[PDB]
Design a binder for this molecule. Structure first.
Ligand SMILES: CCCCCCCCCCCCCCCCCC(=O)OC[C@H](COP(=O)([O-])OCC(O)COP(=O)([O-])OC[C@@H](COC(=O)CCCCCCCCCCCCCCCCC)OC(=O)CCCCCCCCCCCCCCCCC)OC(=O)CCCCCCCCCCCCCCCCC
Ligand SMILES: CCCCCCCCCCCCCCCCCC(=O)OC[C@H](COP(=O)([O-])OCC(O)COP(=O)([O-])OC[C@@H](COC(=O)CCCCCCCCCCCCCCCCC)OC(=O)CCCCCCCCCCCCCCCCC)OC(=O)CCCCCCCCCCCCCCCCC
Ligand SMILES: CCCCCCCCCCCCCCCCCC(=O)OC[C@H](COP(=O)(O)OCCN)OC(=O)CCCCCCCCCCCCCCCCC
Ligand SMILES: CCCCCCCCCCCCCCCCCC(=O)OC[C@H](COP(=O)(O)OCCN)OC(=O)CCCCCCCCCCCCCCCCC
Ligand SMILES: CCCCCCCCCCCCCCCCCC(=O)OC[C@H](COP(=O)(O)OCCN)OC(=O)CCCCCCCCCCCCCCCCC
Ligand SMILES: CCCCCCCCCCCCCCCCCC(=O)OC[C@H](COP(=O)(O)OCCN)OC(=O)CCCCCCCCCCCCCCCCC
Ligand SMILES: CCCCCCCCCCCCCCCCCC(=O)OC[C@H](COP(=O)(O)OCCN)OC(=O)CCCCCCCCCCCCCCCCC
Ligand SMILES: CCCCCCCCCCCCO[C@@H]1O[C@H](CO)[C@@H](O[C@H]2O[C@H](CO)[C@@H](O)[C@H](O)[C@H]2O)[C@H](O)[C@H]1O
Ligand SMILES: CCCCCCCCCCCCO[C@@H]1O[C@H](CO)[C@@H](O[C@H]2O[C@H](CO)[C@@H](O)[C@H](O)[C@H]2O)[C@H](O)[C@H]1O
Ligand SMILES: CCCCCCCCCCCCO[C@@H]1O[C@H](CO)[C@@H](O[C@H]2O[C@H](CO)[C@@H](O)[C@H](O)[C@H]2O)[C@H](O)[C@H]1O
Ligand SMILES: Nc1nc2c(ncn2[C@@H]2O[C@H](COP(=O)(O)OP(=O)(O)OP(=O)(O)O)[C@@H](O)[C@H]2O)c(=O)[nH]1
Ligand SMILES: [Mg+2]
Lengths: 320, 459, 140, 36, 347, 50, 63
């Protein structure tokens, strides 16, 4: 059965599937900190599902055929444009950040849905709990207006409060000059235009705000670039955590049923990411919104609800 | 009437099941076939009306209005399809559906025997009309125009609902055939004064009566072209048709209750005609012209003589085709210059020769050139109001002078003089536009050869 | 309130002017008290004396309106010698309408109140003459 | 094009009330999720 | 809430109402109201926030006060007739108390102040129960005691409710407050016709329940609680805007929609009783409701309000809420006028 | 007559009446106090208890 | 349609409508009398059922 109260009444309870390995682990750090590699190793060693960092096209990867959609359907948010013209008048900077927060919010729901439905833990790369560091860095460099920050906090306030924090937070502390050296080595043309001040603000946001906050309710593990290479040691530390903090200890089948009822409904997950706060960076006028939506409905397998698209080979429509 | 109701309903699945690019071809072609069959309603007898069933009936009053109603739908479809070209397909189909549903309500409104059935359908026409104006109008003010249109009408119609229900309780029926035989005189009392007003004011707002007219210029300036055509050609005539029927049961009280409304209409027609001389918006000028013409209809209906009822019926038909034609002429300029200002584009006869002939013919019917049915109707009303009181000839005469002045002034300003130098997108007239104009004027002028079919039951 | 309306309607028209004004003023004055009561309850006055000032303000206006209506309406019937004519109360209604405009110092409100009060008062006389029921007893 | 509501037009319907008065000047829209 | 407990609490709400409608004894009627109130508080509190706590508290005080007045009327009736049978009362003072008690329960003006606040403070699904199912029990009692009801009192309550409901809704941007004032106005029509023809009270009640359930269901489908949130529906579910448009016009009493039928039939009954001024006044005052329904149609359906960039993410996910009975309810909300004579089944 | 029945004059009246109806403090104390006034005038002025 | 078909179709319509009008007027009169006198099946408001009364000898004799 599709999950709901009836399935819950018949035994589908989260505690019957969650073991001692049913942990949500998030890996955090600065740009070019090798967190992607460490996250991939923890999942393999621990037998957890790995979630790549949620980019602009994360939602595209979870719907339809899984392939990225043209950029107009993402709102023309561009990470490349952000580096070249961080203060552009089209409001690309905040529009990207608002879009990225929504993508992370969706990914966190996908992760929690996986954990609660199968009992298998997941590994994320950053999350909606640490997404603000980029917002703070953007604001401190003058890339976004103060009203943009207010909109971000309004959206974050009414969304993050629904979800539990990660069981484990793994922070990889790479000093800015080392990161500034690794960005140049990585040979990305646009990324090479980043400044240390922006990178320093990102680092300050983790240490000033993120890590102290998560310590109050999570198991926080910190490492350097060298200490991070030893994946076995990191996984050894994770397997020896106590778990005596945070709200995960107060959860029970009843509360997790309500949480699973939320995270499984993606439109309910995104309900408040589009509150009618008319802000120039994220506001789209009616004519552009109308015709872009019409184009979206014309994409293959997008006119009708999944399973009712003849143009992609669905069958038995007259009985579905 | 089912032979017209059902095919009209079938236009809806026809539009929705048509190929993507054949929505205009299919709906136009088949609504013309319906219009063709509407001539079978001409089986009118000299004593009895054509009484189909317990629900619907036609007589010489409703038949010409029914044919005008069914002829106007294909014309509204040709008029609309250009400015709706960039609309998405589903919204085009919904627009056509609103027009089809409006025709369905109208042909049922004009044929209902029972007056509450008339009331409901008479009221049902509000919904699609409002949707057309507010959804597919062009400018911001269309939301206010919808509100004025809705609440002017309801301020009058709700008292009518109370009065009709009161009448049925007392009389026992609202079937119009029964009311012809069971009608009793209305005796003087304050109760009957308000019963008279409740029975009439709803129709007066529709005409519209002078003083209750300010909603009409707003609606026309804001409505799309099809909205203007149906508004001017048929919707105003619901008030006239309602008054023509309900005055049966208001005698003899109408003898003195009419005076304030005759004074408003007799004076109102002169004021609205003079207003037309100073209007700057071409759609607003035509809207004021309609108020002036409908003022005669109100007077003719109120004085209740055979000649005036014949004049009222002929004027209602003639005005419908003329005013709808004028809006289409004004719209064709608008679709080129995107402005309703009358002085913006001048000397257009030099650039659009044939379209200037349509302007001339439309203006000649508006000023009622003999022997057009516009004059026949106006002349009959002038004859009957002279007997009502000889002095009225002065007011009628002055109005005919002013009517010629603004009719030709509109022609002279837009078509003659020197063309505006900087306007250089005046492309030649399309076949669609020329056909649209000629489908107004040709039936109008052909009716001159056989006027009796538009003179109503009193013929 | 039935009793107060009874003595007003018990008396003929254009007779005992001083009695009609007493009745209309009493009817109007009470309405100002009812309006005042809900006002102080639902909008707490700043001070006890502030509430008294508001109560007097509303009650005086309502009493004044009813006083003028009865005075003007009963004189008009007296001078015109037309006891059973709605136009008498049309004059009485507008008079009370103007007083409201004065008390509110708004010529626009006075004109608006004149029409609405004038028509309302005229309709009340027609209903009295022809037995219009507002709260009709069920019969069928 | 046909006119459609802009941001200014939309904000008429975004306040605590439709017709501001001196007595409601301090009112504020309730929280998006009803939580205070 | 545990799903099994939620079902049990919902059935207790229903059972409390049913007891009121099947009882021939005043004590059992009072017990039904007590049971119903006991089970309705948990569903108002089920999201645990201060606004929900305030709403439940304001609801409890109002309903508890009314139930005390109902019991006082029952005992006065017992003193002067020596029996408990649910029917006309045998003392005028008991009739006034019972009528005022039931007006308080229904939220009619001037006991109306709680309805906008309680509805605003509880979830949409709870508001749906509050403004629909909860009217059944008080109306079913009014249906049985109307012969002893003071005509002036009941018509005064009706007129004030139509005025207050109409005026209150003009100043609202919150969808739950709009529905609350819509409810107050509609209770006024139901009780105006009660002295003349109780069958038309039932007709108006049933039709009102259907349209109100339709609106609440469509608000839930999109999780909209504000006018501006509802103005985004065009860029997500265009069909829903058309359904909302039709339902609102029906609630406005426009022909040829179902919501015209109750206003039409009520006008007929009062005119048969030589009541002309009251129906005319009520119909005109009901244009106030039509105005702020039309305003919603303007921002929802007839114009396209500005959107937000993040809305594009919603395009990719289907509507997964149950929307139970919505296709049926919306069709009955709009297309029932041709079947109006069927109102005799209620006779 | 114009000032009385203009669209602007009718619209303002309802707008003014709406603010009177809706501008409330939200306090339990004031709403119930209004219930008390309602019951008293029901019996004292209108004799609804008879 | 020929003139005789329409003519006699009109008579059938008139007969039905005339009969309905008469019945409508009677119903208003019947309803008025039933409500005023309570001697008909309509407006029959319930009274206590006498089959609920206990007729057996009571504990004391005077009753
Ligand atoms: C037989 C019938 C039954 C008889 C019962 C006999 C008595 C037995 C006791 C009955 C229970 C009484 C309970 C009283 C109570 O608890 O409320 C206290 C209530 C609230 O207490 P509080 O929070 O401390 O505030 C005190 C003031 O209200 C000040 O607070 P404030 O912040 O509001 O200050 C400004 C003040 C300003 O006051 C004003 O402006 C008054 C202006 C009036 C103009 C005339 O505002 C008010 O007073 C609001 C109320 C004004 C009256 C509204 C119009 C009625 O205060 C009062 O109003 C005192 C009135 C008590 C009078 C006792 C006699 C009762 C008569 C009632 C009518 C019975 C008819 C039947
Ligand atoms: C005369 C005055 C004017 C006309 C008055 C008419 C009043 C309404 C008439 C009753 C309307 C009932 C709804 C029509 C049936 C539509 C549902 C359907 O056909 O789906 C087949 C239904 C399930 O189809 P689905 O794909 O899951 O969803 C269908 C709709 O979306 C499901 O939409 P839903 O979420 O709203 O489901 C509601 C339905 C639940 O849907 C059902 O389980 C079907 C129950 C149909 C009951 C038939 C009622 C008529 C017979 C009266 C005896 O609730 C009921 O159980 C109705 C009782 O299959 C069955 O259960 C067959 C019935 C087995 C017993
Ligand atoms: C708000 C109140 C508006 C004032 C309405 C007052 C009209 C009088 C209605 C009335 O109660 O008259 C009673 C009478 C029925 O009584 P009956 O038995 O037939 O004869 C005895 C006469 N006392 O009634 C009748 O005989 C005739 C009643 C017919 C229904 C009239 C409906 C009232 C119309 C009021 C508005 C009229 C003006 C329209 C305004 C449109 C504005 C654009
Ligand atoms: C049952 C019989 C009851 C008869 C009384 C019915 C009236 C009940 C009142 C319900 C409406 C409550 C809303 C309301 O009245 O608004 C508050 C208002 C205070 O506003 P304020 O400016 O002080 O007074 C101006 C009045 N011209 O207060 C008032 O104006 C009053
Ligand atoms: C005829 C009217 C039919 C009305 C049918 C209404 C069906 C319910 C509304 C359909 C929309 C989806 C739905 O099922 O409603 C949700 C609601 C349950 O609440 P929900 O928030 O969805 O989840 C509860 C877990 N906390 O569901 C409910 O709580 C049910 C509340 C509505 C029941 C009252 C309906 C009005 C009274 C009907 C009697 C008609 C006489
Ligand atoms: C028979 C007796 C009863 C008589 C009373 C009248 C009954 C009729 C009322 C029935 C109830 C309302 C249901 C109407 C069905 C509407 C469905 C429809 O026509 O299409 C909606 C349209 C489709 O949108 P969607 O499917 O999401 O995507 C389109 C891509 N192809 O959605 C859109 O594209 C949005 C278009 C923009 C919105 C345009 C709004 C104006 C058109 C509204 C028409 C409906 C008005 C209903 C009022 C009654 C009309 C008389
Ligand atoms: C077109 C308009 C007409 C459509 C009417 C459709 C109504 C549904 C059909 C029901 C027909 C029926 O028999 O019910 C009529 C019934 C009669 O009312 P009653 O109080 O019993 O006494 C009548 C004496 N005059 O009274 C009623 O049933 C109407 C009152 C409805 C109250 C809803 C109560 C719901 C309780 C359901 C409990 C079970 C949970 C489901
Ligand atoms: C913009 C419009 C605003 C609303 C307008 C509403 C008009 C409503 C009219 C009110 C009802 C008519 O007015 C009412 O008629 C009845 C008669 O049936 C009168 O009834 C009384 O008249 C006689 C006069 O001898 C008295 O002896 C006796 O007390 C009683 O019969 C009322 O004294 C009168 O107040
Ligand atoms: C919200 C305030 C709540 C306060 C509740 C206070 C308790 C009220 C007690 C009411 C009980 C007494 O109620 C009252 O008793 C007397 C005694 O026969 C009745 O009798 C009185 O009225 C009728 C009128 O024809 C006749 O019986 C008689 O002329 C007269 O004595 C009243 O009709 C009844 O209304
Ligand atoms: C004959 C019966 C007629 C029944 C008519 C139906 C009742 C309709 C009720 C509408 C009442 C509210 O209507 C409301 O009026 C005010 C006019 O001040 C408008 O308000 C507008 O004008 C006022 C000043 O004029 C400005 O201060 C305000 O900023 C502006 O928004 C509202 O935008 C409109 O929504
Ligand atoms: N503006 C913005 N950029 C972001 C955000 N998340 C990632 N990015 C950018 O995405 C780019 C790549 O992300 P990173 O994972 O941090 O760098 P990486 O080299 O690819 O991954 P690792 O070296 O393994 O840590 C960086 O330039 C980031 O600045 C965000 O929330 N906001
Ligand atoms: Mg990376």
């Amino acid at each position: 059965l599709q999950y709901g109260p009836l399935a819950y009444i018949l035994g589908e309870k989260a505690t019957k599937k969650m073991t001692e390995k049913s942990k949500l682990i998030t890996v955090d750090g600065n740009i070019c900190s090798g967190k992607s590699k460490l996250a991939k190793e923890i999942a393999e060693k621990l037998g957890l599902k790995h979630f790549p960092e949620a980019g602009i096209h994360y939602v595209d990867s979870t719907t339809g055929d899984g392939k990225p959609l043209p950029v107009q359907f993402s709102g023309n948010c561009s990470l490349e444009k952000f580096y070249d013209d961080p203060k552009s008048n089209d409001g690309n900077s905040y529009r990207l950040q608002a879009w990225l927060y929504a993508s992370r919010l969706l990914q966190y729901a996908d992760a929690l849905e996986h954990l609660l439905s199968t009992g298998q833990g997941v590994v994320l790369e950053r999350s909606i709990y640490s997404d603000f560091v980029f917002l703070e860095a953007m604001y401190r460099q003058g890339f976004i207006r103060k009203q943009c920050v207010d909109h971000y906090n309004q959206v974050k306030k009414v969304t993050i409060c629904e979800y539990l924090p990660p069981h484990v937070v793994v922070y990889v502390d790479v000093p800015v000059p080392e990161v500034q050296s690794r960005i140049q080595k990585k040979g990305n043309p646009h990324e090479m235009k980043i400044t240390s001040a922006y990178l320093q603000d990102i680092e300050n946001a983790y240490k000033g705000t993120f890590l102290p906050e998560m310590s109050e309710k999570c198991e926080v593990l910190q490492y350097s670039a060298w200490e991070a290479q030893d994946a076995e040691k990191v996984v050894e530390d994770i397997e020896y955590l106590k778990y005596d903090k945070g709200p995960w200890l107060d959860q029970n089948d009843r509360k997790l049923h309500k949480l699973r009822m939320l995270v499984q409904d993606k439109l309910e997950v995104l309900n408040y990411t589009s509150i009618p706060v008319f802000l120039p960076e994220v506001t789209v006028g009616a004519h552009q919104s109308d015709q872009v939506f019409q184009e979206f409905t014309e994409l293959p397998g997008r006119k009708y609800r999944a399973g009712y698209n003849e143009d992609v080979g669905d069958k038995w429509i007259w009985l579905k | 009437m089912l032979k017209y109701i059902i095919p009209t309903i079938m236009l809806m699945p026809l539009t929705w099941l048509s190929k993507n690019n054949m929505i205009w071809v299919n709906s136009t072609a088949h609504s013309l076939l319906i219009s063709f069959t509407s001539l079978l309603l001409m089986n009118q007898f000299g004593d009895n009306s054509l009484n189909f069933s317990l629900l619907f009936f036609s007589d010489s009053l409703s038949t010409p209005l029914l044919i005008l109603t069914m002829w106007l739908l294909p014309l509204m479809l040709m008029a609309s399809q250009h400015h709706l070209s960039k609309e998405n397909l589903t919204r085009k189909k919904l627009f056509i559906t609103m027009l089809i549903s409006l025709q369905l309500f109208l042909i049922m409104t004009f044929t209902a025997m029972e007056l509450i059935l008339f009331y409901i359908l008479f009221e049902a026409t509000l919904v699609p009309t409002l949707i057309i104006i507010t959804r597919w109008g062009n400018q911001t003010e269309r939301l206010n125009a919808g509100l004025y249109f809705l609440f002017y009408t309801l301020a009058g119609s709700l008292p009518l609902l109370v009065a009709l229900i009161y009448i049925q309780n007392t009389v026992g029926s609202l079937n119009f055939l029964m009311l012809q035989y069971w009608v009793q005189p209305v005796h003087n009392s304050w109760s009957n004064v308000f019963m008279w007003l409740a029975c009439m004011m709803a129709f007066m707002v529709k005409m519209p009566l002078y003083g209750l007219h300010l909603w009409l210029p707003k609606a026309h300036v804001e409505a799309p072209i099809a909205g203007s055509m149906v508004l001017a050609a048929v919707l105003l005539k619901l008030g006239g048709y309602g008054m023509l029927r309900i005055t049966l049961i208001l005698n003899p009280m109408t003898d003195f209750m009419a005076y304030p409304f005759i004074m408003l209409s007799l004076w109102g027609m002169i004021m609205t005609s003079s207003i037309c001389l100073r209007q700057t918006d071409l759609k607003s000028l035509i809207a004021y012209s309609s108020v002036s013409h409908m003022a005669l209809v109100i007077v003719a209906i109120l004085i209740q003589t055979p000649w005036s009822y014949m004049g009222a019926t002929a004027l209602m038909i003639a005005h419908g085709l003329t005013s709808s034609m004028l809006f289409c002429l004004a719209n064709s300029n608008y679709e080129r210059i995107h402005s309703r200002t009358m002085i913006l584009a001048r000397g257009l006869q030099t650039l659009l020769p044939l379209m200037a002939t349509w302007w001339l013919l439309a203006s000649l019917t508006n000023l009622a050139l003999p022997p057009t049915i516009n004059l026949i109707g106006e002349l009959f009303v002038v004859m009957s109001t002279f007997s009502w009181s000889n002095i009225t000839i002065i007011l009628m005469g002055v109005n005919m002078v002013i009517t010629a002045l603004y009719s030709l002034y509109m022609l002279i300003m837009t078509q003659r003089g020197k063309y505006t130098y900087h306007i250089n997108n005046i492309s030649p007239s399309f076949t669609r536009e020329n056909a649209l104009m000629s489908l107004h004027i040709l039936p109008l002028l052909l009716l001159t050869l056989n006027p009796k079919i538009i003179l109503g039951p009193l013929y | 309130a039935k009793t107060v309306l009874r003595q007003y309607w018990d008396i003929p028209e254009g007779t005992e002017c001083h009695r009609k004004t007493y009745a209309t003023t009493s009817i109007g004055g009470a309405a100002g008290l009812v309006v005042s009561a809900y006002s102080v309850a639902l909008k707490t006055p700043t001070s006890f004396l502030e509430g008294v000032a508001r109560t007097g303000r509303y009650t005086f206006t309502a009493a004044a309106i009813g006083a003028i209506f009865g005075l003007t309406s009963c004189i008009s019937a007296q001078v015109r010698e037309k006891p059973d004519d709605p136009l008498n109360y049309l004059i009485g209604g507008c008079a009370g309408g103007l007083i409201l405009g004065a008390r509110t110092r708004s010529y626009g409100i006075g004109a608006a109140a004149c029409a609405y009060m004038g028509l309302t008062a005229a309709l009340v006389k027609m209903g009295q003459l022809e037995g219009w029921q507002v709260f009709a007893e069920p019969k069928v | 094009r046909q006119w459609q509501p802009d941001v200014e037009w939309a904000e008429q319907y975004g306040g605590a009330v439709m017709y501001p008065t001196k007595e409601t000047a301090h009112w504020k829209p309730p929280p998006w999720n009803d939580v205070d | 809430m545990n799903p099994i407990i939620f079902i049990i609490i919902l059935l207790t709400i229903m059972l409390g109402t049913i007891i009121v409608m099947i009882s021939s004894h005043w004590l059992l009627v009072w017990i039904g109201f007590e049971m119903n109130m006991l089970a309705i508080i948990p569903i108002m509190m089920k999201n645990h926030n201060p606004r929900a706590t305030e709403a439940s508290t304001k609801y409890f005080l109002t309903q508890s006060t009314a139930s005390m007045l109902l019991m006082m009327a029952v005992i006065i009736n017992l003193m002067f007739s020596g029996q408990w049978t649910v029917m006309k009362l045998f003392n005028p003072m008991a009739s006034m108390l019972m009528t005022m008690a039931l007006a308080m329960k229904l939220g009619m003006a001037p006991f109306h102040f709680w309805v906008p606040e309680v509805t605003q403070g509880i979830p949409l699904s709870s508001g749906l129960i509050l403004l629909t199912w909860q009217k059944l029990a008080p109306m079913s009692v009014l249906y049985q005691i109307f012969p002893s009801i003071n005509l002036n009192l009941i018509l005064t309550l009706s007129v004030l409710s139509i005025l207050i409901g109409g005026w209150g809704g003009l100043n609202q941007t919150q969808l739950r407050k709009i529905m609350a004032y819509s409810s107050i106005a509609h209770m006024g029509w139901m009780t105006a016709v009660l002295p003349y023809n109780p069958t038309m009270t039932l007709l108006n009640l049933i039709i009102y329940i259907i349209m109100t359930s339709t609106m609440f269901t469509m608000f839930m489908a999109n999780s909209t609680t504000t006018t501006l949130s509802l103005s985004h529906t065009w860029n997500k579910t265009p069909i829903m805007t058309v359904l909302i448009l039709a339902t609102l016009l029906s609630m406005g009493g426009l022909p040829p929609l179902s919501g015209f039928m109750p206003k039409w039939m009520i006008i007929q009954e009062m005119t048969k009783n030589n009541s002309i001024i009251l129906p005319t006044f009520m119909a005109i005052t009901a244009l106030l409701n039509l105005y702020f329904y039309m305003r919603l149609t303007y921002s929802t359906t007839l114009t396209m309000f500005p959107s937000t960039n993040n809305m594009k993410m919603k395009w990719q996910f289907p509507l997964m809420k149950k929307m139970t009975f919505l296709p049926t309810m919306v069709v009955l909300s709009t297309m029932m006028l041709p079947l109006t004579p069927m109102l005799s089944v209620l006779e | 007559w114009l000032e009385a029945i203009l669209p602007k004059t009718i619209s303002l009246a309802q707008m003014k009446a709406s603010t009177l109806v809706t501008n409330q403090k939200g306090l339990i104390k004031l709403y119930f106090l209004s219930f008390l006034i309602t019951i008293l005038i029901s019996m004292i002025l209108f004799n609804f208890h008879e | 349609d020929g003139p005789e078909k329409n003519y006699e179709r009109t008579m059938a319509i008139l007969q039905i409508e005339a009969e309905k009008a008469e019945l409508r007027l009677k119903e208003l009169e019947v309803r008025r009398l039933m409500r005023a006198r309570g001697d008909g099946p309509w407006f029959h408001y319930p009274t206590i059922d006498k089959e609920l009364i206990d007729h057996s000898p009571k504990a004391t004799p005077d009753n």
